[PDB]
Amino acid sequence: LRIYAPLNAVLAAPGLLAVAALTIPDMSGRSRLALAALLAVIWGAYLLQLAATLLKRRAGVVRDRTPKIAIDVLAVLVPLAAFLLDGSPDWSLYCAVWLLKPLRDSTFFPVLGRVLANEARNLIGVTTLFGVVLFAVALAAYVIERDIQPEKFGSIPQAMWWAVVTLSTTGYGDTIPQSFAGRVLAGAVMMSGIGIFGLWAGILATGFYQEVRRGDFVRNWQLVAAVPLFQKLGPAVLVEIVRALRARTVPAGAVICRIGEPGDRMFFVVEGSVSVATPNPVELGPGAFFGEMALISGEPRSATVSAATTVSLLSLHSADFQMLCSSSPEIAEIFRKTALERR
Amino acid sequence: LRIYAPLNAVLAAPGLLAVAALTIPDMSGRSRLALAALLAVIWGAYLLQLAATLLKRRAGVVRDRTPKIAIDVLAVLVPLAAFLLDGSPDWSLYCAVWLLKPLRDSTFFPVLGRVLANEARNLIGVTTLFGVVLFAVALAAYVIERDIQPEKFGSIPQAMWWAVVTLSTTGYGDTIPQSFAGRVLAGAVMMSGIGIFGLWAGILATGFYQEVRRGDFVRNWQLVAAVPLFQKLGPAVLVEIVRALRARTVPAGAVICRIGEPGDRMFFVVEGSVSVATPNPVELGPGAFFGEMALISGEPRSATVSAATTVSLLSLHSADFQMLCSSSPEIAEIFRKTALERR
Amino acid sequence: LRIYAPLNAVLAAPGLLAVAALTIPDMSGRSRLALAALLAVIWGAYLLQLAATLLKRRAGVVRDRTPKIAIDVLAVLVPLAAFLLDGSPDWSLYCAVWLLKPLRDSTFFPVLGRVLANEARNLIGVTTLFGVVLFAVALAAYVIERDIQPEKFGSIPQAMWWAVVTLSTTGYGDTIPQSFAGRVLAGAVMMSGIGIFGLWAGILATGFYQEVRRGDFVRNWQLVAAVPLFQKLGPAVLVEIVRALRARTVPAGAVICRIGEPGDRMFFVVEGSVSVATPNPVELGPGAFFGEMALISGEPRSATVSAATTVSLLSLHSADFQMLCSSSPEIAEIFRKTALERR
Amino acid sequence: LRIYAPLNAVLAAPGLLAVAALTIPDMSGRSRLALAALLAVIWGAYLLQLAATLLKRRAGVVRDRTPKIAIDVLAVLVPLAAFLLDGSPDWSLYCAVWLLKPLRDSTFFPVLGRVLANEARNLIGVTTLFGVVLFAVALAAYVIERDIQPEKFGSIPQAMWWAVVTLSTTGYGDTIPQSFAGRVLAGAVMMSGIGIFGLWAGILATGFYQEVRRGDFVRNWQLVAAVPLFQKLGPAVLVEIVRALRARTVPAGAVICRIGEPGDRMFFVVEGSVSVATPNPVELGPGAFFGEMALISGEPRSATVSAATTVSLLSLHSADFQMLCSSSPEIAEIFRKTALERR
Ligand SMILES: [K+]
Ligand SMILES: [K+]
């Protein structure tokens, strides 16, 4: 459960959608006027936020903002530009820029700079290769049907379009090769689809792997640091655990694990506190662990564990947990007894 | 060989299909009445099953059912609602809900709960990014062709449809850019398909991996526990073997390994018993192993080994088997001699 | 280079294609008769081969053929059945069965039996789930547009067809949703493609991995056995090398490594012999290794190494080679001196 | 940042594009003449380059070129052939061959020779199976609709085209099965899309993995060698680091890491030198390392580090860095103090 946990992400989305509702031709005066003024108000809310950021050079503990401020700058300045420069009806186009804000929430863009950054001698090379296949296809298609269909295969651009249709396996159905050689050639084109199709995917494979891997220094190094338990484990041991550990922040008054809900892992608390729906309500603070009972005996959730407040939790798999227990029998002993304490 | 192994899975399917046959317009009086009454009978069968579950809070050994009961409840109550409230012909729609039942047999949903559960700060961000890309394309396409085709590109929704067609690589062929800039733009869209296309796939990569991984605590920890052989092996050693071990339940009188069929692995028996088609018919119970002869000597199946009854088997790869043998020479010695025993 | 190495594979192919040339309607008497008679002759050649296999239960080295014989049986009996039963022109359809021969050459079916065999409690579950989504889409699409287009959406199967078109991202262009609800629904359908799309691919990921892995017992256990060099290395060490080692057979008089071609790996000879184009032509037999010079000094191929005859070779990567050298300094010393011998 | 880093790659591309600009039918006298002459000049530039290469058999440090020269030979000779033999307007087709030049800049073709080289006994087998499935569909589709649509399903090649459309999930929309059996069959065809579609992708999975892996002998062995730091680490330790290490060449006067930009890794310098925007400008030569401060304390880039000149850099991830530090506490000590030196 994730309700009110991300206050900033939740509010922006409706504003983003309003841009589309407005952009409809032949709309009545009553709706269009209201919607148009709304963007000005949304723009103003962002404008207010900007002043706080522009004016303020303090963040508290740790933060860095050069690439990020620029995104914010473009987002607010553009709507302003359209409003002032354009007295005309079509300035709503400029309001599209809010699309950029979602870039900020995600892990991938800062990481991508780097994904793109260390593997592009090969990555660009593959895309350039792609341009080549497309061009070759345009040439091959043009030569075969130019006499029969001056209208359809009249020019290279027309043939290239057919390739666009065929190449990504979209196909329109408006243009087809009447001739035998043409269909056989298509058989080769159909096969070339194999190489092309693979391209779309190999790229994401690396970006996503690295993106998850990065959470390891913050969430699995600094975050783990909170749990004193991890101190006895070796550097080599930690990395395996580090890839394994995962993170979320559960909102207050919500339930992390329902009572009796199958429990095949345990949760560690980094920040915030949780409450255990037990004979003796137990509040767990940072560095604490729960649901270990579930692993030691194999039974579901011991108690409904509810995050009293927004709390950051780490989870350990039964496979991983066993590794912890074998490494440190004394620690395993601690979980067994602590578990008794929870129930 | 899987025949009568899953008694519940086999029966539900015909009922599921019948919902579609009924939903055909302009059907004759004779057939439609009969098929319509069938749903009431199937509904009743489920109703009977529900009473057993609702009424009974007892199971056998260990079981947990909160998320699951709700599914069953919705599946039966809805058909009821349609039958009573609606005397009208179109109540067959309500019978669709049986599609929910298949969710229950699979490993994916409870695990998915977790897959979605610990990786969605990034996952949602990706989908949100996607909504944005679709929107940008709608705007871009509309601006270029509005004057030429008021009929086709007259409005954003119309442009958005083209994007739907192009984006997933489906393409209808009823709409196409007539202008040079439009086709060039399509070239970027064609490329943007690369990122989009990857989205569909990255998500499944993690869920499926985790789903197989999960079988490890039950099938590869508790299940292995049955074989006394695994006790010597270290915690570190077990995980590699654990990922490697796989499971099924072979039904009675069926053949697990046809005699002379190639034997490149061995089978371990957790539950049930098996029979070996040899000079001395041998019945193997839980914790027992067979086919080892095949591995020690490299030979095909020693005997037709048939499951006398429904039996749960674990199998070990030749690569993995060697690891077992190297770790414990005495165990390797045992398998060689046991193997003599089987033949 | 692969030319005459696979004699059986080369010959079957032309015959396989001939089935299609014959099937074309309104062909002249002169050509059609000739092609028709050819199948009878090809059938006869296979018939001769069958008698050899049926009559003979001898192999002379080690072999197993129950599942395989059945394929051969069906392939020959069917053409026979059509020839005798049908004096009619359309018996060429029966000749299609030769397509089964290709299954025999490949690694995948015997393995697939097994891939399907230990993972289907989950794989079937996913496919059945897929049927459910398809059905749900048919229902949702039908209800929305039945009044407007009784001709297009008049029935469930008409709607189902649209689903087939949309679902695999094929899209014909003939049918589209005019209504607002329909296009928005399409947005969900567009997203549902994510799950559908990954399905096609997740399955192949497992079979192909396993298929390559399997060559390890034959090629990387028994095959390695030939090289005395591998004897010193530990069971744990061998598996890493075993995944790494790869195999082919290079035909006689051909070049394995053209002289001065880059040499970033070395080759081991299991069967057959090779010749080294050097000051002292050197013939290497089984258990021998070459191109080690290339790794020790980093230089390209030392000499043109050509297989005098059909030879089976294993190759070791530079990363892997270093591991071999670090494990056994004495062995590394041997490769350096042997290398001097080659040059 | 990559600007003037690749001088040869940058210039060739415009020439490649001009081939398409010329090939447009019904163009004016003024433009077509000029563009046509440009190819002759570009051809001449390449001709000039070839003479240097043909004439010169010496490079500098270390090089090889048999397969590569042939590519260059074909590229230059063909345009010449068209120029001399063809006085006619359509000799621009011959200019397409420049597409080959991009093959040279990439990792994949030499590696592909090898990817194709050790795994094609299986890869060809997969494709052959594919050709067969296509044929089976042609036969199946023809038989069902031949009487109803003699014009559409009149012949096998007409049916085969439908298969081309359906199989790659392109679909034109011009041809559809009217009959019930045909649509049901399509459901199986739709599902067969699972296997086919995955084909396009499994191939790239291995080539790409190997392609990145190869950079390890040059970049991660030779690159490792420049840094004296890597000498202490064990052979087993190096491979994990080797896969992890990545490379690029940042051009002169550009910024490697912007000041204050986040610093979650460090950079090692193999060739060239860098300058640190610090109190005491520091120039780092080969074997040197920077950004370690960022890792030791976790803070962003210490100083703007700019490559004074074209410089080749290696980077170490925080997870990997910790491994380095744990293996050699004294080295960790060195980085902490060196880091102080940088700031
Ligand atoms: K399509
Ligand atoms: K189409």
PDB file of C-alpha atoms and ligand atoms in Angstrom, chain A residues 171-173, chain B residues 171-173, chain C residues 171-173, chain D residues 171-173, ligand 2:
ATOM      1  CA  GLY A 171       2.271  -2.669 -41.404  1.00  0.00           C
ATOM      2  CA  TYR A 172      -0.565  -0.418 -42.809  1.00  0.00           C
ATOM      3  CA  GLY A 173      -1.961  -2.704 -45.602  1.00  0.00           C
TER       4      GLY A 173
ATOM      5  CA  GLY B 171      -0.533  -0.206 -37.559  1.00  0.00           C
ATOM      6  CA  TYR B 172      -4.014  -0.154 -39.268  1.00  0.00           C
ATOM      7  CA  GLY B 173      -3.142   1.401 -42.695  1.00  0.00           C
TER       8      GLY B 173
ATOM      9  CA  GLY C 171      -3.409  -4.708 -36.768  1.00  0.00           C
ATOM     10  CA  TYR C 172      -5.237  -4.903 -40.137  1.00  0.00           C
ATOM     11  CA  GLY C 173      -6.746  -1.374 -40.362  1.00  0.00           C
TER      12      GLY C 173
ATOM     13  CA  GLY D 171      -0.628  -7.184 -40.501  1.00  0.00           C
ATOM     14  CA  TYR D 172      -1.805  -5.164 -43.607  1.00  0.00           C
ATOM     15  CA  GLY D 173      -5.644  -5.563 -43.197  1.00  0.00           C
TER      16      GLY D 173
HETATM   17  K     K E   2      -2.577  -2.767 -41.364  1.00  0.00           K
END
